Write a protein that binds this ligand. Sequence first.
Ligand SMILES: Nc1ncc(S(=O)(=O)N2CC(F)(F)C[C@H]2C(=O)O)cn1
Length: 167
Amino acid sequence: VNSFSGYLKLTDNVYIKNADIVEEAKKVKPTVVVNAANVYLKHGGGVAGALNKATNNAMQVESDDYIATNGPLKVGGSCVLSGHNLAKHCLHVVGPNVNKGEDIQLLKSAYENFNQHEVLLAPLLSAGIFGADPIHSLRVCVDTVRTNVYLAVFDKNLYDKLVSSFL
Ligand SMILES: Nc1ncc(S(=O)(=O)N2CC(F)(F)C[C@H]2C(=O)O)cn1
C-alpha cells in the first residue's frame, strides 16, 4: 500500500491521473519524482521548468554543479539528484526531443531508467514541449517499465484522450 490517490489503473504496474506533477509531488512526497530533463539539465520550461520553480531554483543550482563535474547526460540517460521539497530523490531522465531531431527509438531507453526504482511519480517522457506523441509515449511506458509508475498528466483533455484510446 502507498499514498497515491485517484489514479486510474492501466496495467498491473502503470497508473495515471490528471494532475499537476508539482502539486502531486508536494502532497505525496514520493520517494522518486521523475523530471523531463535535457542533457544539460537546464530546467527552463515544461515539466522541468515547473519543478525547478517549485524548488525556488535549488534544483537548477544542484544541476549546474552536477554538469560542471560530470558533463552532459546522454539522450536516453538519467541521473539521480535531490528531490528538494518535492520528493526524496529526483530522477532526471532525458527523452529524445523531436523538436531537436533526436531518434524516437531512444524513448524506450529513457523509460528503462525507471526500472531502477520500485515506485515513481513521473510525467510522460518526450511529451509536451519535447514534441513526441503522448499516446506513443504511454504505449512505450507500458511496454517498458516493470516497476510501479504513477503518471501525472497536466492537461485534462489529453488525459481523457490517453485513457479513451488506451489499448
Ligand atoms: N506541470 C507540468 N508541465 C508540463 C508537463 S509535460 O509537458 O511534461 N506533459 C507531458 C504530457 F502529458 F505529454 C503533456 C504535459 C501534461 O502533463 O499535461 C507536465 N506537468
